[PDB]
């Protein structure tokens, strides 16, 4: 029973993370016909050809001066000096006419992605956020509608149907002819993903006794980490998104063969405070956790090693979260871990000449600090709250994180245009303010 649930968790792990590998943007520039003929005629500087063709984009303007513009010089059927063709033609190179890009650009990568295939650069750059937005919309919509399908059919036919739909959707998306169909299949599988993922957790929690809930939760975390580790290995040997999608989709097809009421928390004034503080903390932590990975997977010079190292530091977080129990109070680790995720974000915007040996350790520290805080909320939930109230609170928090994940990607991706450090100020503010609301949790007049 444990093996099946762990395999299911590991298989669900790449669904919300693979956008780092499936959709990635490489360096590109506008292409002009006839430049190849001159390059064949004159091969003095194949490398400097770019230098001799791409315009001189200035600081902070390279996003809309070399990737979305081209020169109007007629290279073909023109006599050149083979060294500086532009200098001889015109004394000043800042006065020639420009124009919109054409012919689908030219990329520099041995692999392929959705950006490379469908040309999602320049004015269409906002189409990449739809990928995550549709999946999160599916996550939100599938949470409410899963209860009805648990009745009038049974608790057995749902899992098989969800697994079959997920596998078929994955394969068909791997065989998609146009852009709209891929979005449709993403939305279609977004429901069944969480629909089948929640059942494994519920079964694992129910089957094991109350004395090993912590152990099985740690086992689930270890399974998630292992599933995250194996995905980095596959993307190393399969540099095409169709191959990678098929390779991560086929195993799903292969392996298939006087009562606690929710209205009592808002009447007594003592239980109306912590039940709001915990909700706010959970929402903030989920938003931060979702944002950090997407920020990291966009400005990395070494993606594989950074991903592996960041994923390898999530076991000590659980170890310390378990060790701190029964020895220290419940708010000191919470405050410290919430404060550790803000200082790192604040520092991460002030180290220009220290790259390649500091960003990795700072990102690891921030990731561990975020991971520690999430476990404490779950432990407090399991300690202080009854069954039914938490049985609805899990769905409520899932809906909260789903709406947070709907709103996040647009803000994260489209706020980097004004300045590259803007998304790293909101994270610092949220982290540094979430550590000041936990100090209102202790009850006043606590007699020793």
């Amino acid at each position, epitope marked *: 029973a444990f093996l099946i649930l762990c395999l299911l968790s590991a298989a669900f792990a790449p669904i919300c993370v693979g956008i780092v590998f499936l959709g990635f943007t490489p360096d590109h520039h506008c292409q002009s016909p006839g430049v190849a003929e001159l390059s064949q005629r004159c091969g003095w500087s194949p490398a400097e050809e770019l230098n001799y063709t791409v315009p001189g984009l200035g600081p902070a303007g390279e996003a809309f001066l070399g990737q979305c513009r081209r020169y109007e010089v007629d290279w073909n059927q023109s006599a050149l000096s083979c060294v500086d063709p532009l200098a001889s033609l015109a004394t000043n190179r800042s006065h020639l006419p420009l124009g919109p890009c054409q012919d689908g650009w030219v990329y520099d990568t041995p692999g392929s992605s959705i950006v490379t295939e469908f040309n999602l650069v320049c004015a269409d750059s906002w189409k990449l956020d739809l990928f995550q937005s549709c999946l999160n919309a599916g996550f939100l919509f599938g949470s409410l509608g899963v209860g009805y399908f648990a009745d009038r059919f049974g608790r057995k036919l749902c899992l098989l149907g969800t697994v079959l739909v997920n596998a078929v959707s994955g394969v068909l998306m791997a065989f998609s002819p146009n852009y709209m169909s891929m979005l449709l299949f993403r939305l279609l599988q977004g429901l069944v993903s969480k629909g089948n993922w929640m059942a494994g957790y519920t079964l694992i929690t129910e089957f094991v006794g*109350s*004395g090993s*809930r912590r152990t099985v939760a740690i086992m689930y975390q270890m399974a998630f980490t292992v599933g995250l580790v194996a995905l980095t290995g596959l993307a190393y040997a399969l540099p095409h998104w169709r191959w990678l999608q098929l390779a991560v989709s086929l195993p799903t097809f292969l392996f298939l063969l*006087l009562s*606690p009421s929710f209205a*009592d928390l808002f009447r*007594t004034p003592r*239980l109306r405070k912590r039940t709001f503080i915990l909700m706010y903390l959970w929402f903030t932590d989920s938003v931060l956790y979702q944002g950090l990975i997407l920020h990291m997977g966009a400005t990395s010079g070494n993606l594989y090693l950074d991903f592996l190292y960041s994923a390898l530091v999530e076991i000590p977080g659980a170890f310390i979260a378990l060790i701190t129990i*029964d*020895r*220290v*109070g*419940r*708010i000191y680790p919470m405050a410290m871990s919430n404060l550790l995720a803000g200082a790192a974000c604040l520092v991460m915007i002030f180290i220009s000449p220290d790259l390649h040996w500091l960003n990795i350790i700072i990102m690891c520290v921030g990731r561990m600090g975020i991971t520690i805080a999430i476990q404490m909320i779950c432990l*407090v939930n*399991a*300690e*202080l*709250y*009854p069954t039914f109230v938490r049985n609805l609170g899990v769905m409520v928090c899932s809906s909260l994180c789903d709406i947070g994940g709907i709103i996040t990607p647009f803000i994260v991706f489209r706020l980097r245009e004004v300045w590259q450090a803007l998304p790293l100020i909101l994270f610092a503010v949220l982290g540094l303010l979430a550590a000041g609301v936990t100090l209102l*949790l*202790p*009850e006043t*007049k*606590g*007699v*020793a």
Partner: nanobody
Amino acid sequence: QLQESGGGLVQAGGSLRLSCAASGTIFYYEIMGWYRQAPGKEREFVATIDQGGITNYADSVKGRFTISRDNAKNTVYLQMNSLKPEDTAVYYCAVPDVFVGRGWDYLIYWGQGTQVTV
């Protein structure tokens, strides 16, 4: 409102049972426990229990005391057997504070307890 029961005068440290009652709001949303007067000492700790069912114990009474929870009658039970002529104190029912201190050091509710001697 916390109220206790049980108690008596055992002859040679025999088995005895203690019961603590709750109101209904306390019984479902926080953590209960038991504390010992221990004359000559300010306060002593014995055992706890929470919603999940995980239990703690004191290093001096480990393997002799058992705590169980009853949901029908809204009560928390404690069973002591094979006592020794060293446990003569007053037993209180209390609700500790988790967020501040060490998790069992501070109290916000108590019910004046009861006295049992051996």
